[PDB]
Design a protein around this ligand. Structure first.
Ligand SMILES: O=c1ccn([C@@H]2O[C@H](COP(=O)(O)OP(=O)(O)O)[C@@H](O)[C@H]2O)c(=O)[nH]1
Lengths: 369, 372
C-alpha cells in the first residue's frame, strides 16, 4: 500500500545499504522510487537520473538544488507517501525543500550514517545545517547508540532519534573455500594470517596496526594484509620498510573485492580512535572472521568481549599484541569464536530483521491523520 | 534609524558581481552596517567586514557543498550580528540558500532577491531548476529585477506568484571618464589616429560575437578602425577563427580577460553589443559613463538603456549590415558623434545615477521592515 522513495549515494558506506533496503522492499510489495545522482544497481523499482549537466558560471555544479528538484518532481507526479534519505548533510536539506515545494504532502525519514557527523558536524560552518536537517525530518533514525549520543551533544537537535543498526549483504559475505587462489599470494604457508581493511586516513590509526603486527609476529608465523590505499600510505609503507618486515606485510592495494580475501583471513584488526559503526566488522564476522577492535565509538555495539571478539584500549599495541598471539595459539577457542561471531551477525543484524524495523517506522509515521 | 544589511554576490566576472559590491560600498558610505557573505573576497575600506564561506574540510563528498555552506554561514552571520536584511543578488544558488537560512534563524530576518539577467533567461528554461527558481522567488519578501524586460520573461518562464519590482543597475561614476591613453594606444599599435570599436563582454554563444566581427568586416572596409574584443570563453576560439577567414587579423585585438575596463573604454569611440538575448549589461552603461556611444541590438532590456534617438542606436539582431551602416555613418560625422556621446553621458547621470538607484534599494529596505 506504500509508495516509497529511497535516496542514497551510488560513499560506499551510505549507499549499498539504502540500496539493499530498496532491493528488498520491492520484494515485500512496495513501490520503490530510487531518486539518486548515479546509475549503480526488478519489476517494482524505477530509477531517476538527477542530471547535473546544468552549469554556466558553473563554478559549483548545482547538484543539491538539482537533487531537491528531482525529489519534488518524482513525489508530485508519482505521489509518494514517504521520502527516505540517508546521510544527513547533502540529501536531508534537499528533502526539506521538496516537501516545502510540494506542499507538505509527504513524510520524511532521515537516517544518520556515522560520517555525516563525526567528520562534518565538527566544523560549525555547517553544524547548524545538520541540526536543521534533522529537526525538520518527520522521523529520524541512526545506525548506532554511540551515534545517537554524538549527535545529541555535537549537534544537539530538538529532535529525538531511534536506533536501527546496519545490516550487511549476508548473500555476499560467507565462509569461502579460499585456499586455492590464496596460494597465489605466496601465502599458503600455514601462516595464520591477519587482515586490516580500514579507510586509509590517519584517524583510523594504522600506525598501531603495523606496530602491533611486529610485536605479535615474534611469537606467531603470521602474515599481514593491509587493504585500503590513502593519505597514510607513504608513512605506513615506511613503518614496515624500516621496521623489520615487508616480506610479510604486503599492501594489497585498494581492492574492490575485500570479501574474498576476508574469508581467506583468520582475524582482522581495527584500532581506530573514532568510528560510529563498523560496516567492515560485520563484513568480517558475517563470513566467520574473529576480530580485535578498540573500545571506541560504536564498536561495543558490534563486538561483545567474549565469544564474538575482543575490545582493547585505544592505542595499546603491546596489549592488542597479547589477544592476537593468545588466539592464534589455541585452535578450538579460535574456531569457537569464529562461529559465534558469525552467529551474532545473523541474530541482531539480520537483513530481514532490520528492513522489518524500517517498514514499521514507514507505516507508523504515515498513520495519525 | 540606520541599518544592518547582508549582501551576497559572486566573486567577479558578471553583472551580479560588481552591482552587489558597489551597493555594499555605497550603503556603507551612508552609515549602514554592510556584512558581505560570499564565496570569497570580491574586488579595504572602513565599514563592512567580510565573511568568506570556506568550502574546505570535506571528504567523500560528491561535490564542494557551497550552496549548503553559504546557507549555513548566511544564517550564522545573521544572528551573531543581527542583520535586518539579507540581500541576495544572482538568484540561482542564492535565493534558495537565503530562504533556507531565513528558516534556520526563526525568520527574524527580511529577504530581498535581485534577479539579474542570466538566472532567468537560461536557468528558467531548465526543467531541473525552474520549479526551484519559482519557489526561490515567491518565498522572498521583496524581489527586484534589473530591467522591466527581465520581469516579463520571469513571468513567461518561471511563472511565479510574486510581484517583482524594477531597479536598474548602476555605476561608480568616479571610475569612468574621458582620459587619454596615448601610451597604451601605442603598445597596441593603434597609432593611426582614430576609430577604436570596442566590444567588452561575455563569451557565450548568446552574445552573438559572430555578428560583432561580421559587422566589423563590413565596417572596416571604410573607416580605418580597430576592433577591441575583451573576454574569453566557449566561443572564444570559434571567433578567433572567424576573423582569420576575413583577412582582418591585423585589425582585431583579442585582449581576452581584462580588469581595467576603464582604461580600454577611455580610448574607444564606438561600442557594440549585438546580443540575441541580453537583459541590460552594464558594459553599455560603463561606456556611456565616459562618453562612448553604443550600438546595441533591439532585444531584452537594451532599449531601456540605449535611446535609439540620441544616446545610441538600436538595430534588429543578426542585421550585421544594419549595425555597420549606422556605425560608419556615426563615426564619419564627427559632429554628430561628439553630441551623441555627450548625451549618452547625460542619460547615465540622470536615469541610472548611482545616488538615485542606491537610494531606491535603501528605500526598499526601509519599506519592508515596517509592518512586521
Ligand atoms: O573581460 C571582462 C568581462 C566582463 N567584465 C565586467 O563584467 C560585467 C558584465 O559582463 P557580463 O557579460 O559577463 O555579464 P552581464 O553583462 O551579462 O550581466 C561588466 O560590468 C564588466 O565591467 C570585465 O570587467 N572584464
Amino acid at each position: 500500500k506504500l509508495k516509497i522513495g529511497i535516496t542514497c549515494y551510488p560513499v560506499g558506506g551510505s549507499g549499498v545499504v539504502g540500496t539493499e533496503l530498496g532491493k528488498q522492499l520491492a520484494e515485500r510489495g512496495h513501490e520503490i522510487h530510487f531518486i539518486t545522482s548515479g546509475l549503480p544497481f526488478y519489476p517494482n523499482i524505477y530509477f531517476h537520473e538527477v542530471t547535473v549537466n546544468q552549469y554556466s558560471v558553473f563554478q559549483y555544479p548545482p547538484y543539491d538544488l538539482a537533487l531537491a528538484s528531482k525529489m519534488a518532481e518524482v513525489a508530485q507526479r508519482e505521489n509518494l507517501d514517504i521520502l527516505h534519505v540517508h546521510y544527513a548533510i547533502p540529501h536531508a536539506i534537499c528533502a526539506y525543500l521538496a516537501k516545502q515545494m510540494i506542499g507538505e504532502r509527504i513524510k520524511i525519514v532521515t537516517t544518520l550514517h556515522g560520517t555525516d557527523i563525526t567528520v562534518l558536524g565538527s566544523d560549525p560552518s555547517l553544524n547548524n545545517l545538520i541540526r536543521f536537517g534533522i529537526e525538520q525530518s518527520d522521523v529520524v533514525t541512526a545506525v548506532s547508540h554511540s551515534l545517537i549520543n554524538e549527535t545529541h551533544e555535537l549537534v544537539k537537535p530538538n529532535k529525538d532519534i531511534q536506533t536501527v543498526y546496519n545490516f550487511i549483504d549476508e548473500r555476499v559475505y560467507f565462509k569461502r573455500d579460499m585456499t586455492q587462489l590464496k596460494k597465489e599470494y605466496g601465502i599458503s604457508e600455514s601462516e595464520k594470517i591477519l587482515i586490516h581493511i580500514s579507510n586509509f586516513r590517519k584517524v583510523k590509526r594504522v600506525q598501531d596496526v603495523v606496530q602491533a603486527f611486529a610485536k605479535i609476529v615474534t611469537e606467531v608465523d603470521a602474515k599481514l594484509l593491509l587493504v585500503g590505499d590513502g593519505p597514510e600510505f607513504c608513512t605506513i609503507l615506511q613503518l614496515v620498510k624500516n621496521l623489520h618486515i615487508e616480506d610479510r606485510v604486503l599492501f594489497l592495494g585498494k581492492q574492490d573485492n575485500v570479501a574474498e580475501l576476508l574469508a581467506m583471513s583468520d582475524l582482522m584488526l581495527l584500532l581506530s580512535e573514532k568510528e560510529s559503526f563498523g560496516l567492515v566488522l560485520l563484513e568480517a564476522m558475517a563470513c566467520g572472521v574473529p576480530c580485535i577492535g578498540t573500545r571506541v565509538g560504536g564498536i561495543p555495539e558490534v563486538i561483545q568481549h567474549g565469544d564474538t571478539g575482543y575490545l582493547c584500549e585505544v592505542g595499546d599495541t603491546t596489549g592488542v599484541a597479547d589477544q592476537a598471539i593468545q588466539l592464534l595459539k589455541d585452535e578450538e577457542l579460535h574456531r569457537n569464536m569464529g562461529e559465534r561471531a558469525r552467529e551474532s551477525v545473523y541474530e541482531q543484524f539480520r537483513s530481514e530483521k532490520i528492513v522489518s524495523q524500517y517498514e514499521t517506522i514507514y507505516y507508523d509515521v504515515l498513520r495519525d491523520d
